[PDB]
Each structure stands twice: as structure tokens, then as C-alpha cells.
Coordinates of C-alpha atoms and ligand atoms in Angstrom, one line a residue:
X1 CA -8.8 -13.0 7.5
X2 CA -8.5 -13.6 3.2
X3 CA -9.2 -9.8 3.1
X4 CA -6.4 -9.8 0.0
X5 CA -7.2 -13.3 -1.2
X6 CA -11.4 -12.3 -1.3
X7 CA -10.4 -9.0 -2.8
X8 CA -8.2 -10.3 -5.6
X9 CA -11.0 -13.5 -6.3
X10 CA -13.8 -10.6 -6.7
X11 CA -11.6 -8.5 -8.5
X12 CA -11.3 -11.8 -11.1
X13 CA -15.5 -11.9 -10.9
X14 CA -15.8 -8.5 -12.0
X15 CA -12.8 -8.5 -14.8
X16 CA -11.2 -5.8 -12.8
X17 CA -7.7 -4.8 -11.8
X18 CA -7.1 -3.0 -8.4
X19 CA -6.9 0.2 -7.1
X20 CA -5.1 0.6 -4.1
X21 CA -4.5 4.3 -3.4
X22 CA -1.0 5.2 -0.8
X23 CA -2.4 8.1 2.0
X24 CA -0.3 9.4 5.0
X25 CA -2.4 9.0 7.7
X26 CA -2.7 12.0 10.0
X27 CA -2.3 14.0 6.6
X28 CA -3.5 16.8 6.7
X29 CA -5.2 16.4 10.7
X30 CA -6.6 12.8 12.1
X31 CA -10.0 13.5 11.0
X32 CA -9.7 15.0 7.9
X33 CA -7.2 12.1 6.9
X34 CA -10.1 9.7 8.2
X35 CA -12.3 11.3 5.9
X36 CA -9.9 11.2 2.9
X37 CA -9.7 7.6 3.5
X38 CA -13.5 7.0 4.0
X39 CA -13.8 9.0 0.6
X40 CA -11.3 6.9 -1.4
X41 CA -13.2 4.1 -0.5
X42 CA -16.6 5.3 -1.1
X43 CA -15.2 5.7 -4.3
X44 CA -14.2 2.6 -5.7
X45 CA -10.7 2.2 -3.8
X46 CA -10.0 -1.8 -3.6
X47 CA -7.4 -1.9 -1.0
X48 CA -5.4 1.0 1.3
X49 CA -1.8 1.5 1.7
X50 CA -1.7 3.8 4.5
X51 CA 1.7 5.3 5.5
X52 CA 2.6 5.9 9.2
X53 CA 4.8 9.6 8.7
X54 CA 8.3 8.5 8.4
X55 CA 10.9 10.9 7.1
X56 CA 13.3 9.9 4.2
X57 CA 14.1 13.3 2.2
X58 CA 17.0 12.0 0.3
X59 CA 14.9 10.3 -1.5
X60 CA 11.7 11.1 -1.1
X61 CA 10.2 13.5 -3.8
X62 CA 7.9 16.5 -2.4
X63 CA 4.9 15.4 -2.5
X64 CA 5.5 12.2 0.0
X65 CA 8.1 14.5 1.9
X66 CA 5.7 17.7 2.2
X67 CA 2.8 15.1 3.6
X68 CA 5.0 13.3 6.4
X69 CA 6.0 17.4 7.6
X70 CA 2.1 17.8 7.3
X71 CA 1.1 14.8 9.8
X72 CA 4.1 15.5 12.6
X73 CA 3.1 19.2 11.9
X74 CA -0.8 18.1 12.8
X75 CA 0.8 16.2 15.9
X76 CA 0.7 13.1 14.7
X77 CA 2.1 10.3 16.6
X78 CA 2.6 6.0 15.9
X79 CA -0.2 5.8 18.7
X80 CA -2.7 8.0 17.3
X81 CA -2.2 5.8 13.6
X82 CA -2.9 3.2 15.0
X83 CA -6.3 4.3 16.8
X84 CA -6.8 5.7 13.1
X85 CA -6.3 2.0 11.6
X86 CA -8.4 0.5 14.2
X87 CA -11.0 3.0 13.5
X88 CA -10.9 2.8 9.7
X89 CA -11.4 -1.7 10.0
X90 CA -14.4 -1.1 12.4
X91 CA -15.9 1.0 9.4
X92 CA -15.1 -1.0 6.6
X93 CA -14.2 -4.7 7.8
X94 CA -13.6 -6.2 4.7
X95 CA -10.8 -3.8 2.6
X96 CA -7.6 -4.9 3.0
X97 CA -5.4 -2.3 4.9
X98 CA -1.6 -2.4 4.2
X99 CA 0.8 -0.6 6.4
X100 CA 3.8 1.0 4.4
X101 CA 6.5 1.7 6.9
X102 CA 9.8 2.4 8.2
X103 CA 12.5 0.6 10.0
X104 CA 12.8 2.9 12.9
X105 CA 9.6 2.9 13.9
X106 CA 9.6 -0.7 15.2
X107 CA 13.1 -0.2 16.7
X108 CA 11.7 1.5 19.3
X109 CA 9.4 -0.7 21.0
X110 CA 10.3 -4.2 19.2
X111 CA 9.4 -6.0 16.4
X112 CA 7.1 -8.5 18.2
X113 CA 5.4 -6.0 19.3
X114 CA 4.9 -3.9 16.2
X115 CA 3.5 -6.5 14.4
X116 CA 1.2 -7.3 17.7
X117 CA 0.1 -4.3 17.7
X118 CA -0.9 -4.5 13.7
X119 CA -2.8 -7.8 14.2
X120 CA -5.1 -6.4 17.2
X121 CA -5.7 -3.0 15.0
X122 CA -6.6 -5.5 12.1
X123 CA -3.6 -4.1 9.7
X124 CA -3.7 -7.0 7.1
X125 CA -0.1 -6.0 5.6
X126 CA 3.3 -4.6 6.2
X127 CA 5.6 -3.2 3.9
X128 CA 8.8 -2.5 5.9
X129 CA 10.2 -0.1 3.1
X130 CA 13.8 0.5 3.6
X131 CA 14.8 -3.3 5.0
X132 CA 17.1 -5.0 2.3
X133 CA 15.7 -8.7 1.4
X134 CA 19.1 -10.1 2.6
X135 CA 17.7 -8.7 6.8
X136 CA 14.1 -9.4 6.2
X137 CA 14.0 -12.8 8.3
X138 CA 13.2 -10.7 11.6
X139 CA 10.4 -9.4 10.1
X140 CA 9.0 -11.6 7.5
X141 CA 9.0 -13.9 11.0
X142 CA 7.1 -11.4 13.0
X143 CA 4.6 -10.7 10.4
X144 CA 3.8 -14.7 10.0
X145 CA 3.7 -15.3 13.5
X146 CA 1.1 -12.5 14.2
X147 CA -1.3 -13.4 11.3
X148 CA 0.3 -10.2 9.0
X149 CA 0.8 -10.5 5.7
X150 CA 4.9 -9.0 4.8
X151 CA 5.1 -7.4 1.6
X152 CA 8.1 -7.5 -0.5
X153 CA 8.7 -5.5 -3.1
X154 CA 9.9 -6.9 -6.2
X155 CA 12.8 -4.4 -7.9
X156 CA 12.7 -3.7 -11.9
X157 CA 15.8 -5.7 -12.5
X158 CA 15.0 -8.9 -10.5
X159 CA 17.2 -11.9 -11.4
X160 CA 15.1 -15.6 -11.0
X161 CA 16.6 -15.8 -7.9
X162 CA 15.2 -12.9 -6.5
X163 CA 12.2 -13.2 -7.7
X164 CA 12.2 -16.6 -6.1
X165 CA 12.5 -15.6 -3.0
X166 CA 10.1 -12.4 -3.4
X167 CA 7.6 -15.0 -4.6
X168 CA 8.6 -17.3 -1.5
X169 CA 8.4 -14.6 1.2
X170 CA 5.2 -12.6 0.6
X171 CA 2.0 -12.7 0.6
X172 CA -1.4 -10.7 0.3
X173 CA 0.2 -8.7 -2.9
X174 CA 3.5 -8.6 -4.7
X175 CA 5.0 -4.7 -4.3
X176 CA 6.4 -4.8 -8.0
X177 CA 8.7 -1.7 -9.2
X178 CA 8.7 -2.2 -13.3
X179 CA 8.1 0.6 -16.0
X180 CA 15.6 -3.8 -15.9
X181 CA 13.2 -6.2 -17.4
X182 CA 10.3 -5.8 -19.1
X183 CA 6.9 -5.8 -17.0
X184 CA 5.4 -8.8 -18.6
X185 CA 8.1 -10.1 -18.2
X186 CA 8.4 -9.8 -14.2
X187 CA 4.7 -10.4 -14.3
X188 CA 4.9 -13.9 -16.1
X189 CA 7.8 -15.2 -13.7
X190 CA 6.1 -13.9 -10.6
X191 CA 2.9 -16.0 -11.3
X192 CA 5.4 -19.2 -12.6
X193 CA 6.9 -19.2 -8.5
X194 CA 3.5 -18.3 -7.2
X195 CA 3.9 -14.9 -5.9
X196 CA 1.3 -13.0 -4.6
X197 CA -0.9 -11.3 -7.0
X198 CA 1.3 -8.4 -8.4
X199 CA 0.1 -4.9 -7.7
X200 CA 2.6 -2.4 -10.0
X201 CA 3.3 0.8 -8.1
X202 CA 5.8 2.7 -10.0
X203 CA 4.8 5.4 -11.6
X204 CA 1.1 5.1 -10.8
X205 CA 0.6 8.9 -11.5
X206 CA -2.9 9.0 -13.3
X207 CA -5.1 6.0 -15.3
X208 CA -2.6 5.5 -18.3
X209 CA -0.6 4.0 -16.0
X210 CA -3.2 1.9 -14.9
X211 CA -4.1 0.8 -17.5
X212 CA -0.7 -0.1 -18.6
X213 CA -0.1 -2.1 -15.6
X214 CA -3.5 -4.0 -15.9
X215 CA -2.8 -4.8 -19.7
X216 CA 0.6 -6.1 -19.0
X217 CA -0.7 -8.7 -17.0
X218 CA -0.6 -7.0 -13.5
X219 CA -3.2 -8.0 -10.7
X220 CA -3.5 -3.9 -10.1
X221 CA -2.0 -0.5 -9.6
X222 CA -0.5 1.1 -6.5
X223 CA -0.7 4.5 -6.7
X224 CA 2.4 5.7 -4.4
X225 CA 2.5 10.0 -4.7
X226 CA -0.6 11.0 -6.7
X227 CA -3.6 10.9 -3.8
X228 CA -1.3 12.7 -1.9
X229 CA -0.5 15.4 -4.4
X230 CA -4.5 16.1 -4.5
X231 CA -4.3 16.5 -0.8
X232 CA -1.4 18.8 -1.3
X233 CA -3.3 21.4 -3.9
X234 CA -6.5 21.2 -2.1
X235 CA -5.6 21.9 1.3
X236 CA -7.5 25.2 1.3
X237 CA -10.8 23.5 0.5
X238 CA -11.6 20.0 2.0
X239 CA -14.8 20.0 -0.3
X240 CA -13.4 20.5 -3.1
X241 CA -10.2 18.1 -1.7
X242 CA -12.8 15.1 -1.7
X243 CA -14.6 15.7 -4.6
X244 CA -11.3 16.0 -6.6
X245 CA -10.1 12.4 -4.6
X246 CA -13.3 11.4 -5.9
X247 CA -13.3 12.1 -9.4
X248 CA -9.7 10.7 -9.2
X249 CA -10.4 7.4 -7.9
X250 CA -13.2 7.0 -10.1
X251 CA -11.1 7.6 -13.3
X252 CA -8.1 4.9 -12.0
X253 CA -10.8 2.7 -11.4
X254 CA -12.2 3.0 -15.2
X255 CA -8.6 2.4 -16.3
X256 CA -8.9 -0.8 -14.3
X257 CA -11.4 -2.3 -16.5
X258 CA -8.9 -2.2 -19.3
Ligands
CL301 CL1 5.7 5.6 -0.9

């Protein structure tokens, strides 16, 4: 529907890098993760990344792990996300939503119909997080056939062959992992094999790194952990939960103008 390639163009109009804030949806109930999402984008957020709960603990730091207990704590089920993602396009029709998932999720009722289910909800990505490039064809395949952008994520230490093929198989955004090789550098051979428009999201913790990421070159900022740690140390007070999400998204998006 050119939700990322309109974003990206305006984004260029207005001499801006993008925002794209990571939530798990469900987290901390349906509706108040509905209303964290509305907030973000009332407040300047240029694209989602909205995380069905998964559960990877050997790697996951607290913050992502605490929020994936919050949602299955809140009862949150595949099904209910996706009535959430439906609801959230029929609100805002234009943001780009990408889904950031994992692998067992669709090996339970197929990959076809996982990404059918993504297209008819209006998901405009998928970021299958824990499938090695080298068993991506099933899905890359899936997502193209149902109209879904399939994200790759492009590793601090890509060789030119790699990034060839990152460049080659996504689209919508580049998922780019750089503080190895330096980020300019990354950045420059992306754009040579016509990648997607990189979006760096490691690290993304508050607007210096923005702002780093911008300055090197980068299309925008993912921010993978810190909208979630807000969540976390305001759950007492959704008020003050959304104004602090507010005055958050407002400062990453000043860092974006750098
Ligand atoms: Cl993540």
C-alpha cells in the first residue's frame, strides 16, 4: 500500500529521520496497550514495530522479557493481536505497522496462513526474528506472495555478500544492528545494492543515539527496549505512563532533525 515507501519520501520532505518505537502489544492489558500505541503516535512516532509476546529469556534482557510475562499474564493470545493490529490500521490508515515476531508462532497454523492473516489485518511488515538468512526462503516467499513486506536484519559484521542478499530480500526498511564495521560504512554499501531504507536499532536507548544513527547516514532509529522500559516504571500510573511516552517520543523525534 507504499505505507513505508510514502513514509520514508515525507520523511526526505521534512529533513527528518524516523522514529519507529518497538511495543508488545497486549502490554500491560489490550486497551491500555492500544492506548500506548495511539499515544506514541499522537506523538510524533513515524512507523510501529509491534511485537506479538514471544518468549526468548536466554537472551532477552528484562525489560523485553518482563513485558512478554506482562501480556500472557493480561491473557493475551496471537488472536487477540491481531484484532489489536486490525484495530490500530482502521485508526490510523497510513503508519506503517511492522510485526516483529517469532518462529513458533507461525508453526502452528502455517506460514501461508500467518502471513494471510497479516495482509487482511493490514500488517505492512514482518520481521521473523530468530530465522537464520540461510532458511528465510519459506518466509521471504510467504510475505511476497501476500503483499508483506519481510524485513531482514542486517548484522554489525556483514560481509558484501551478506549484505547483498539483505539488500536483495527486503523491503519496506532495512533492520540494521551497527554501533564489526563501522555504521557508515554498512550504511553506504546498503544504499550501493539498494536496500531498503536503513532503520538502525541497536542500542536505540534515548535521542543520542538517534541522532547518531541519523548523522551517520541512517534513514531512522528503531528503538527496540526503551518504550517498553517507560511502560515498565509507570505501570502504577497510566497518566503519568503516557505523558512520560510522550515526552519521550517527542525528544527522539527532536534528535531526528539532526
Ligand atoms: Cl526486540
Amino acid at each position: 500500500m507504499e505505507r513505508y515507501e510514502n513514509l520514508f519520501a515525507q520523511l526526505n520532505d521534512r529533513r527528518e529521520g524516523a522514529f519507529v518505537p518497538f511495543v508488545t502489544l497486549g502490554d500491560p492489558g489490550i486497551e491500555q496497550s492500544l492506548k500506548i500505541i495511539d499515544t506514541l503516535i499522537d506523538a510524533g512516532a513515524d512507523a510501529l514495530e509491534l511485537g506479538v509476546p514471544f518468549s526468548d529469556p536466554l537472551a532477552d534482557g528484562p525489560t523485553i522479557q518482563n513485558a512478554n510475562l506482562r501480556a500472557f499474564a493480561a491473557g493475551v493470545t496471537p488472536a487477540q493481536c491481531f484484532e489489536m493490529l486490525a484495530l490500530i490500521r482502521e485508526k490510523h490508515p497510513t503508519i506503517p505497522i511492522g510485526l516483529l515476531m517469532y518462529a513458533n508462532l507461525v508453526f502452528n497454523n502455517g506460514i501461508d496462513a500467518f502471513y494471510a492473516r497479516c495482509e487482511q489485518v493490514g500488517v505492512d511488515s514482518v520481521l521473523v526474528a530468530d530465522v537464520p538468512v540461510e532458511e528465510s526462503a519459506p518466509f521471504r516467499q510467504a510475505a511476497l506472495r501476500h503483499n508483506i513486506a519481510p524485513i531482514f536484519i542486517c548484522p554489525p559484521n556483514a560481509d558484501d555478500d551478506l549484505l547483498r542478499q539483505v539488500a536483495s530480500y527486503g523491503r519496506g526498511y532495512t533492520y540494521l544492528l551497527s554501533r564489526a564495521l563501522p555504521l557508515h560504512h554498512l550504511i553506504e554499501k546498503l544504499k550501493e545494492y539498494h536496500a531498503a531504507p536503513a532503520l538502525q536499532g541497536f542500542g536505540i536507548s534515548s535521542p543520542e543515539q538517534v541522532s547518531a544513527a541519523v548523522r551517520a547516514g541512517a534513514a531512522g532509529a528503531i528503538s527496540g527496549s526503551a518504550i517498553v522500559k517507560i511502560i515498565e516504571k509507570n505501570l502504577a500510573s497510566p497518566k503519568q505512563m503516557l505523558a512520560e511516552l510522550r515526552s519521550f517520543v517527542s525528544a527522539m523525534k527532536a534528535a531526528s532533525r539532526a
